[PDB]
Amino acid sequence: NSFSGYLKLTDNVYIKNADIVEEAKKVKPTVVVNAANVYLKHGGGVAGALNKATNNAMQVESDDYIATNGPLKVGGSCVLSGHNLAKHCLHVVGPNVNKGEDIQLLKSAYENFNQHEVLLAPLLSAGIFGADPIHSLRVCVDTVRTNVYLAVFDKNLYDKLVSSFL
Ligand SMILES: O=C(O)[C@@H]1CCC[C@H]1c1ccc2ncsc2c1
């Protein structure tokens, strides 16, 4: 495939210090993962950045999805358009520790990735979702069996994740 400059962590997990919006514009992957909430309200974090890069088309599509189907579950997902960034966007809901959600749901959230042969993704439940990113990377490698390319935006976080990976 066309992903370049990634560090191989395992047989199927790769990682790079990159902005997932810029990686998606360059690669045009079949699937880009969004770090969504149950309402698909893409205000901040990686969801806000991806939505802004679509000129708000992601949010307009998402509002129609919620009006028809109701909210997602924590640990769940839905497949929507990738707009100008990818063929599809897999919106995955990891638990948000800052909302008091159970971190135990993180493994269920990563299991959604196994439905897609290859994905470009951020770390679930990290950043403003409040979980320990070292734990999120461990759950990712121990749960996902398909090929995942993780784009870590924060440079200091990337360096910490590499140096502490077992
Ligand atoms: O990799 C990170 O530093 C965090 C961890 C969890 C969400 C990631 C994130 C956040 C915002 C953002 N904006 C553009 S790419 C991008 C990616």
Residues 6+ positions from 127 with CB-CB distance below 8 Å: 35, 45, 46, 133, 154
Distance of CA 149 from the midpoint of ligand 1 (Å): 14
Residues 6+ positions from 115 with CB-CB distance below 8 Å: none
Domains with residue ranges and CATH for the chain: 7-162 (3.40.220.10)
Q: Is-contact 79 89, C-beta < 8 A?
A: yes
CA dihedral sign of residues 98, 148, 55, 58: negative
57-70 CB burial, b ≥16 within 10 A, e <16 = ebbebbeebeeeee
Nearest CA to ligand 1 atom 11: 46
Nearest CA to ligand 1 atom 5: 127
Measured from CB, residues less than 6 Å from any atom of ligand 1 are: 19-21, 35, 45-46, 49, 122-123, 126-127, 152-154, 157
User: Using H for helix, E for strand and C for coil, what is the string for 66-118?
Assistant: HHHHCCCCCCCEEEEECCCCCCEEEEECCCCHHHCCCHHHHHHHHHHHHHCCE
The resolution, in Å, is: 1.2
Closest CA to 116 of 155, 59, 77: 77
Tokens standing for residue 133? 């990113």
For a pocket test of ligand 1, which of 16, 20, 46 has the largest count of ligand atoms closer than 8 A to its C-beta?
Answer: 46
Distance of CA 132 from the midpoint of ligand 1 (Å): 14
Closest CA to 23 of 96, 82, 110, 92: 82
β-bridge pairing 88-92 and 31-35: parallel
β-bridge pairing 118-121 and 147-152: parallel
